[PDB]
Amino acid sequence: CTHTENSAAYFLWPTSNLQHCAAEGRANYFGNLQKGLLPRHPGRLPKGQQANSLLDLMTIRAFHSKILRRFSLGTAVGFRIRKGDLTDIPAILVFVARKVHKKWLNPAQCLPAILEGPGGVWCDVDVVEFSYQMFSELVDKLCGSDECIGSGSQVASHETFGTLGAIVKRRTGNKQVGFLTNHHVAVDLDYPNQKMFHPLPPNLGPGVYLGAVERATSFITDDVWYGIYAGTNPETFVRADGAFIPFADDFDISTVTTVVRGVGDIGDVKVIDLQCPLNSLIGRQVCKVGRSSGHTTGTVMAYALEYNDEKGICFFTDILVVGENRQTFDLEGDSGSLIILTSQDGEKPRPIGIIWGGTANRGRLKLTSDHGPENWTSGVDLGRLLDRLELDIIITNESLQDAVQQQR
Amino acid sequence: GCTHTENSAAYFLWPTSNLQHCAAEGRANYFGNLQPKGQQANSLLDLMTIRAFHSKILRRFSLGTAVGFRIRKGDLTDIPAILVFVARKVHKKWLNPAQCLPAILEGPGGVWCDVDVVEFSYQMFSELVDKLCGSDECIGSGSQVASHETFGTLGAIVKRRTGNKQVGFLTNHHVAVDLDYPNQKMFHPLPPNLGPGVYLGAVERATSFITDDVWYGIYAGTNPETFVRADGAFIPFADDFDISTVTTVVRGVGDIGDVKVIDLQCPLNSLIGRQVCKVGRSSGHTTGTVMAYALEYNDEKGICFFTDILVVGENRQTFDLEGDSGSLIILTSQDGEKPRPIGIIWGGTANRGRLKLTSDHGPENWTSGVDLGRLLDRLELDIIITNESLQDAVQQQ
Amino acid sequence: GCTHTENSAAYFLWPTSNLQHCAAEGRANYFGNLQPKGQQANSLLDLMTIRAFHSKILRRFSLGTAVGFRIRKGDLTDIPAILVFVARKVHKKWLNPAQCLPAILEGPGGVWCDVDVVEFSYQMFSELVDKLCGSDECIGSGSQVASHETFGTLGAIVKRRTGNKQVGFLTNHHVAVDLDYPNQKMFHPLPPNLGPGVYLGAVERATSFITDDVWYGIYAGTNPETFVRADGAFIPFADDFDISTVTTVVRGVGDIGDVKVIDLQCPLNSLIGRQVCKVGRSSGHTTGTVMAYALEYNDEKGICFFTDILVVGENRQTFDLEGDSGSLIILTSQDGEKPRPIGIIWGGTANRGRLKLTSDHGPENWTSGVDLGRLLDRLELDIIITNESLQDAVQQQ
Amino acid sequence: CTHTENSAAYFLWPTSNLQHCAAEGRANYFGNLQKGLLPRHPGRLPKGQQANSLLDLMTIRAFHSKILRRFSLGTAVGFRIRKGDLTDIPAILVFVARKVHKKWLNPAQCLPAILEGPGGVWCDVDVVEFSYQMFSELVDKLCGSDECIGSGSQVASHETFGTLGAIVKRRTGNKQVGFLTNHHVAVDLDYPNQKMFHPLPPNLGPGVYLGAVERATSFITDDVWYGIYAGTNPETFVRADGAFIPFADDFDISTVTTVVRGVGDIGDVKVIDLQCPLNSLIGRQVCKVGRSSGHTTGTVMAYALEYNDEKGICFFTDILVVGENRQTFDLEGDSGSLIILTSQDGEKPRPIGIIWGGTANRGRLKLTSDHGPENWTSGVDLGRLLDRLELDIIITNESLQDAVQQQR
């Protein structure tokens, strides 16, 4: 062979947040916030100090998380939901096993309507009750009837199967062309390789060998992923689930399309800037094309969903989506699907995330009294995922052909 | 220390009165002594007396019996009848004479009735259901009440007639009781391990089975071990529970009148065929029809079991779902009178019973209800039906 | 009809006394008021008082506690001690100061004791076993007694002190009770659906949990919901049962003396370390050692549970098997006196508890026993220990 | 091909006992017995009228079966067991869920000590409490290590496996040479064929194709099998389980031995004459060589075991064996093993049965107070089984070679 490739199943597990200095760095940050707080009057809050960004909301939530998570199942940041509808009121969402009348809650349990954080920036606190295939020509094509491979296509390891998310290329090294899907779909620890096939692996049925997972990430610290401390727990991780599969050397890349079937041509990834106005993400209509539920549409309901489970480990998921018109946004098997902003002004729809859709990252949510609870879906921030995997999205077939010729 | 006395032990009483020789011989003597233009049955007592006397031939090739009105082509008649439930109703051509049920039975004293054959076997969302399950500012009939593992519906606001005369509520036995626990604490709408809620109190007393002669005042059959399913539980409100948050209204129904005793000697149509309703935590407000009374057991034990009230929901819809256990069964208003409660739903629904009425539809669910007048007597409870009477009951505890 | 009155309903009482504010405040007031050459504990009361006062720090990193004598290198000492049960006993090098248990605790009044750490967790064939299981011409302590699904051992011949003063027997609660059944009939040795046997009678009354202050006469701990596992059931003999076939002897032991009350103020070695025996339907005659008293709960409820007696069988053999539930725990004769019963086996054994004593052997089974004196008081029963006293009891029913 | 073979899975099920005349024939027999009974005194029974045969005992049992089976789990005929030992006292054995003292039984339940039947013949009634691998060089050889096939060898269909019982030849038709095993081991209804292999079928491991089941019987009426009515039920059947497998046309019969390994050369089948003295069967020591437990020894404890289960169907099993010295006589997998009388006077051991060892034909029995219950085994009467299948046993290798040359 020409160059040396890694020939070992090799695993690195996080230890940085377990260094006394790394925990002290987080403790010092919140100690600083606490030392300077000087909370405002028993009273009125100025409008210019109202939170106006994801980062504004996430810092208020982190600062007040002990009281917030004492009698709740989780929190996220977004807009207050009132009578089932999104308002334009910036808010921390507090998820509860069941919303009950104030009269059945002592004052310690009853959430406040307003929280003021460090620097005087304040926001609303909203209470949301919360818990943790299709037949069409499109679904047929995604699962094997189509002459091309692309976003939405079924991708299968020996064990599980999911949805190809995007056509991508490595920024460094061999600069190989491949695809992005989620890590759980693509990986099984009982095997030394992770081969992927479309539509099925040889033990289960017909299919072409697409290539094998080269690298994948599951957990990333919040301070590395978001650039801030998103909570006070020294062990805080984002489920940054993602796997990169370089196309096999004898796989015909001319069968790959960069089009998202059912959507059309998409634009470049839209990064989530934590400092821009909330309404460029929260409340935006999204769509996804998956091998299980085909094309669906939904609403981004919240960002940076937090969950505290068995040990003193805090877990974040980036994007919370609910399907429109009381239809589920996804099903099991849609994991890896691209989460795409629908066009507002005629611009190409742009991807913002990839469906996580896994172990505990699908559940139910209650919005109205006249109808049953609704499924919610979780997504990983795509701009951040591409950064950690060091990949670029390829959005045109002309750019795909250039990228193939430029592999080394 | 404390001022008054109350339960400090989980203490169980089990029935033994019917196992006495003299008790069984009294029952055998009654029937042994007893053994067509006959002044034909006009009351529940008349039908139950005929069925008890003929229970042996009736139970031989059947799944159980009840009393009511003959059902013909799926419609209730006004013909007084013993209903005989069978696993499958088949043409008379396929039955030997011993198996084919009669059309008429004559009982002691010449009182007679008809015999009818019925084929038989043993979540909703709304603003109302949301109020019952935690969104309302009050607790009352229909509210979700929860033990650590099981959930049901509060039936009535009640007061004990004796002892500490405590105010509390009535619900069903095993919505309220978990045998892994030494106490029986109940919450609205959820226990703390599952979600938020107010601690209501704990079960103080409950009853499950009662002998037929004590419950009905008559021998309901020839089996010396005959019992009635009487699964009711009484929960006194906790010392720190604010009873000013309690309503005596039945939301979705309104103010109710006093309990309507089921008198076995009154005309059959004052109970059979009557329209009823219920407000429950799972299905909200539903409407149904009383189809039968005093249904027997078919569970192979060797022991007769009775259930008081059989209800089928109107327009082929289910009258109750699981979680409606404990809801009040209420006679709907007919001539302007306040609706009056006659029973309480016995939970069921782990293995539902269904009955076949017409050939063009599948079988329909049926609901069991416990006779409320008799249940209140056995637990020595008075129902409280106005908020002013409730304030009085609180002061008198 | 009948002449005397008896139970006609399955009726359940559940404890609520400890849920009163005044009851819990009395307990909190007692301990709040309370808060090394100290006249060091000499009785069960002394140890239980120290353990209750320090229960919070003791229960923080432990699976439960009991009182007795320190165990050192697997052998019982005569050193009065609180035993602290842990999931695994580890070297002090691996414990922070908050976790490492003390060696000495001083309680109210300066009374002190030792603190000991024990690692812990929650068929035989013979001529005797054949006699107990149906081959003997008599029924007595040790005989197999069976419900429709569960089987156990008859504990004692007893008489009710009040009401009908009926003669019957004492056994454990859930050998005797099946919650699917309205009655609780028991047979020797098998119910009719399984094999031949004589109908003994049915359960009349039973108790499972009792508050600690009512059972022990003291607060056994700081938890306002503290209960004792008191699972005993009383079965009056059936009207047609021939009590002349009943013996008061304990086969394999002999004539027993009266129940030996466990007095909390007497010296510890009159109970702790005492040799005991038991005659049970599954393991026949076994011998064991009383290792501890008043063991606490560790079951995460939020509720303290107590068990009275902890027994480990001698020579590394099990003291009981499943089916021995209900056997009498009897102090063996030491100076010629008749053996005297002190407890009754609480069944267990679905998920046995074991404790580690030495490093060269696996963990050993331990047996739970219920304090017999207190159980008899709570069910208002007198034990009958001679056949002449039994004839008297029969005549006086 | 030369001659025509059956090319269909074809099933015949008994209907004869359902004819009104066949039920009347049985009813008339017991009606005759009842009409003439004239029972003896409240008292003494003559010795010359004491039952002295299997047939004597079986007729007393049939005549009195209503009272016998009212409070019992089954009956058999044999010798009274007293304090765990066989006596020489002819008796009906009555099997009970548990033996209890008389004092716990009303007089209706308590069995009598004596029963007198038609003709004045009488017998004892005995009460018995009752309910429903190994590593050695021999077991290795039986399961595949041996160079030969013979009695005791493992024989496997695709699903189950058992023990080859005897080398046999058909009395009629093609007169093919093959082997006898039990029907349940050899047969599965989901397949059209029943191929048998030693030691394993191809889906499970290595093995040679032995041939396929040609014919098998499961249930035979008592009056056909025993030559008498063994009970009053118009639906009475013997579990006459047996399957005949002719050796495949390309199977090398020179690999077959007629020796019973661990026993030696055996004699001809010993028929069970229902009129001969009881002690030529009851109480006799037996042995069996099976693929699961190898060579074991046991005692014939009883004959014509009766069982009444769900419908009004009475079932008989011929031979009841208990292992010696509290060792189990067989295990699952020994089904089909030959049940052989050990030598008394130096004569070759002779086979009397074949282990049924199946659905409900193994259970436990209590004999002593100082020890736990013991396993019992069931066998099918071999002389009768060979008659119904029309087969002869081959007991010498010289006779085997003659039989092969004489196949047509």
Ligand SMILES: Nc1ncnc2c1ncn2[C@@H]1O[C@H](COP(=O)(O)OP(=O)(O)OP(=O)(O)O)[C@@H](O)[C@H]1O
């Ligand atoms: N810890 C809690 N658990 C459950 N319910 C709670 C809790 N704290 C508050 N609530 C309920 O949530 C209510 C506030 O809900 P929320 O903040 O969503 O109001 P809103 O957005 O103005 O209106 P809407 O309820 O229609 O969304 C309180 O009035 C109370 O009934």
Ligand SMILES: Nc1ncnc2c1ncn2[C@@H]1O[C@H](COP(=O)(O)OP(=O)(O)OP(=O)(O)O)[C@@H](O)[C@H]1O
């Ligand atoms: N033991 C039995 N098991 C099953 N079916 C029986 C049995 N005995 C009678 N039947 C059937 O039930 C019929 C009687 O039905 P039933 O008494 O309900 O009549 P109906 O009320 O006049 O009419 P409908 O069938 O419309 O209700 C018999 O004619 C026979 O076909």
Ligand SMILES: Nc1ncnc2c1ncn2[C@@H]1O[C@H](COP(=O)(O)OP(=O)(O)OP(=O)(O)O)[C@@H](O)[C@H]1O
């Ligand atoms: N919370 C705890 N969990 C587990 N092990 C503990 C804990 N606290 C103390 N220990 C261990 O138990 C030891 C004390 O044991 P213990 O009191 O039984 O001593 P001993 O009776 O003198 O000797 P022996 O170990 O022979 O019984 C400590 O030295 C420590 O190793």
Ligand SMILES: Nc1ncnc2c1ncn2[C@@H]1O[C@H](COP(=O)(O)OP(=O)(O)OP(=O)(O)O)[C@@H](O)[C@H]1O
């Ligand atoms: N229906 C029955 N169910 C259970 N046990 C019974 C029944 N009828 C009788 N017995 C018991 O069986 C006893 C008779 O047993 P059996 O006929 O085996 O006696 P045996 O052979 O002389 O002695 P051994 O009991 O030592 O075998 C009776 O005394 C009685 O205790």
Ligand SMILES: [Mg+2]
């Ligand atoms: Mg809201």
Ligand SMILES: [Mg+2]
């Ligand atoms: Mg009808």
Ligand SMILES: [Mg+2]
């Ligand atoms: Mg120690």
Ligand SMILES: [Mg+2]
């Ligand atoms: Mg015997």
